[PDB]
Amino acid sequence: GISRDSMHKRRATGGKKKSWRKKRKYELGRQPANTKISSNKTVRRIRVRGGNVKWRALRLDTGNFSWGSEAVTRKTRILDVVYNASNNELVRTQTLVKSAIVQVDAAPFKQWYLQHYGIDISNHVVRKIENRQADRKLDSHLEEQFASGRLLACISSRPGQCGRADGYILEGKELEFYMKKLQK
């Protein structure tokens, strides 16, 4: 099957390598997951070397995404793949791979923001909410996309390896970089 050996490669000088042994099981590869965004979740269990387990996600719809500046992580629905640095064909096929830029539902984070800062984007409770409002700062670029209900996010997990699609909300100069790539 798929093999990760170097025997089929050319030498650094350019000469060929004559085969001196058959393929080994301990140097195999496997078919890519090609995880897609779909509400029909499907993750198949793969037995790997040592009797260990890998989770190969064929279809996913939700992910665990973290708002780094706010230090809050929420499970949210994945809406769309918008950018992929490796292959633009993975964008129109809606493939979920590590480091792909996706849009996630902003609703779970809005609820936390309202519950935490008391703002939309009980005597002892109002005492602390206003206290936390003193040091409240929200990026203009990050707030502008709360109106549409979608947040740009980057997948930080490997769905074909762990079976999950987790990530973090884009912000700072990383958000500026990617939103300029989408400005066409």
Binding site: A12, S69, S99, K137, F177, Y178
Partner: protein, 147 residues
């Protein structure tokens, strides 16, 4: 800027969007640029501690450790991107004739942007994990030719 690829390049684990400031924190914390000492008596160049380049294969700011053999040689080719060919000259002993013959070996090595190198310069390379099909070494020091 250093952002020239299709993806956004950054150091892993360095959070750049923190409300607090990084003033008074160690490298790689508070959004501060991350760098480290490789040991073995080698100095961290000022160009790596105060630079803005992103190189995950850099020995001082990347994610590669130096362990194994430390070798020296002369820069033979500096035409690849962040990779050079190091020529190592040595003598092979011919037993029957009790004499020597000159031999050489070309060792590919990764060079981080913090180093400036030209053909003929003397370089020291430290072994690291495989970085490509042929590269197993990282440049640790460059001495300009004629110095």
């Amino acid at each position: 800027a250093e952002q020239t690829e299709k993806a956004f390049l950054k150091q892993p684990g360095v959070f750049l969007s923190s409300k607090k400031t990084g003033k008074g924190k160690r490298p790689g914390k508070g959004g501060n640029r991350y760098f480290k000492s490789i040991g073995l008596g080698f100095k961290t160049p000022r160009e790596a501690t105060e630079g803005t380049y992103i190189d995950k294969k850099c020995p001082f700011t990347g994610n590669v450790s130096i362990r194994g053999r430390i070798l020296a040689g002369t820069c033979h080719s500096a035409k690849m991107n962040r990779t050079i060919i190091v020529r190592r000259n040595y003598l092979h002993y011919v037993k029957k004739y009790q004499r020597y013959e000159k031999r050489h070996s070309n060792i590919p090595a990764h060079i981080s942007p913090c180093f400036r190198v030209k053909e003929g310069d003397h370089v020291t390379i430290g072994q690291c994990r495989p970085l490509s099909k042929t590269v197993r070494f990282n440049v640790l020091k460059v001495i300009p030719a004629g110095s």
